[PDB]
Amino acid sequence: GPSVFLFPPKPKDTLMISRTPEVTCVVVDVSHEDPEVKFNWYVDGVEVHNAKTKPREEQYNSTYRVVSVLTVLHQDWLNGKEYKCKVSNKALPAPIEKTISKAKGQPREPQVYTLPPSRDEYLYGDVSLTCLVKGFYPSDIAVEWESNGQPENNYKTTPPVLDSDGSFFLYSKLTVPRHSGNVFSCSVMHEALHNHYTQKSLSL
Amino acid sequence: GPSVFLFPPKPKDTLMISRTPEVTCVVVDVSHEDPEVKFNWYVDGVEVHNAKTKPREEQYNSTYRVVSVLTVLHQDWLNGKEYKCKVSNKALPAPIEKTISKAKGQPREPQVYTLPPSRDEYLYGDVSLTCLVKGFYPSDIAVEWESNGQPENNYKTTPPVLDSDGSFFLYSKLTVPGNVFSCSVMHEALHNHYTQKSLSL
Ligand SMILES: *[C@@H]1O[C@H](CO)[C@@H](O[C@@H]2O[C@H](CO)[C@@H](O[C@@H]3O[C@H](CO[C@H]4O[C@H](CO)[C@@H](O)[C@H](O)[C@@H]4O)[C@@H](O)[C@H](O[C@H]4O[C@H](CO)[C@@H](O)[C@H](O)[C@@H]4O)[C@@H]3O)[C@H](O)[C@H]2NC(C)=O)[C@H](O)[C@H]1NC(C)=O
């Protein structure tokens, strides 16, 4: 029978009131023979009725993919409410229930450090600006770079790594062309920061 | 029906002739009604006959788990040979085939850079020594720390991240509250598959 996956909102969306955080219930391997699928949504077990179901997509393996999207309130997500997606289909015996919520436990503020390229790296045409983000909890976080107020997007960021004290860390690497707008900033968004946002700059 | 999982050797094992790299074929959810399983192994499609298949193991959920281990030659793995486990069981319609190999592509040598703690971090009781390992391919790699020739184990390493040029990078962080610290990296594209970069204070 078909299978269900339930996805949390993107971290950046929960942390800024101007954005729209969402929970996404994805159904895979929906067949032509049994192609009707229903959705019930529950917030802390309380049925909700504001979910919107997206258009199914026939996949190259002759299966169907169905998606239901529920908008959540920023503070419901951040206060630890649970969201339950129930999927009904007559090919499945019982309805499938999946639940998700923010990780439990005391949020911890990230410390942000910018580290310049090793002197050795300059023997290459591009050097790496590093941003160490450590000690945060939970692991939901967003990291971006900018210079002179505009985004710098030639960066990659590691996933969060569980550290030995139960907090998380990550690094973000901005690749720059060695000439050094000599001022670069690492921007970090996390629920435990004041105004959910902080910047740490790097001279060159 | 039963399921097959095929595991590669540990990166360190392919890189040192003193270690013994192995490919491991694990079969789960074998039933009592049809519990005989046969393994056939192939290297680049040519059947090989030196795998060591262990005794089936009844699990607490009343399934059996059978595992077969094929020792591989270091240079076969690094030369990109494909290892195929074929698993036969009377409960299966057809035999299950799983194949594994080193990631395809031209190997690229890692650059290793050690970065000292931000001076700001010292206002806390523990500081982070950073080891940047970038530009490597494939992503199979080993990273370790030592000081004064002995292992240092208060470190964590990120998984490899695909960079924009198709190579990988990672960071490794050593937490210290031995003034010479070394980040050691093993990778197929390095000379003698090993390099070190040290950091004072
Ligand atoms: C027909 O083709 C489609 C499209 O390729 C296949 O759909 C994929 O099926 C696989 C497994 O059947 C799914 O793998 C799962 O991915 C999950 C997350 O990734 C998806 O969701 C996010 C949504 O934002 C995307 O960013 C991402 O790119 C993917 O779209 C994982 O969470 C799943 O993990 C679960 O199972 C593993 C089992 O080990 C556990 O470790 C986990 O805890 C968890 O239980 C899983 O890895 C994949 O998501 C499907 N893609 C889509 C788009 O739905 C069909 O499988 C294929 N049909 C066949 C082959 O018969």
Swiss-Prot record, chain A:
Region CH2: start-end pairs: 1-104
Ig-like domain segment(s): 2-101, 110-203
SS bond partners: C25-C85, C131-C186
PTM info: Glycosylation on Asn-61 is required for interaction with Fc receptors and ability to activate the complement pathway. (Microbial infection) Deglycosylation on Asn-61 by S.pyogenes EndoS or Endos2 endoglucosidases prevents interaction between immunoglobulin-gamma (IgG) and Fc receptors, impairing ability to activate the complement pathway.
Positions of glycan attachment: N61
CH3 as annotated region, ranges: 105-204
Oligomer status and interactors: Immunoglobulins are composed of two identical heavy chains and two identical light chains; disulfide-linked. Interacts with FCGR1A; this interaction mediates IgG effector functions on monocytes. Interacts with FCGR2A and FCGR3A.
Function noted in UniProt: Constant region of immunoglobulin heavy chains. Immunoglobulins, also known as antibodies, are membrane-bound or secreted glycoproteins produced by B lymphocytes. In the recognition phase of humoral immunity, the membrane-bound immunoglobulins serve as receptors which, upon binding of a specific antigen, trigger the clonal expansion and differentiation of B lymphocytes into immunoglobulins-secreting plasma cells. Secreted immunoglobulins mediate the effector phase of humoral immunity, which results in the elimination of bound antigens.
Disease: Multiple myeloma: A malignant tumor of plasma cells usually arising in the bone marrow and characterized by diffuse involvement of the skeletal system, hyperglobulinemia, Bence-Jones proteinuria and anemia. Complications of multiple myeloma are bone pain, hypercalcemia, renal failure and spinal cord compression. The aberrant antibodies that are produced lead to impaired humoral immunity and patients have a high prevalence of infection. Amyloidosis may develop in some patients.
Name the record gives this protein: Immunoglobulin heavy constant gamma 1
Span covered, complete protein: 120 to 326 of 399
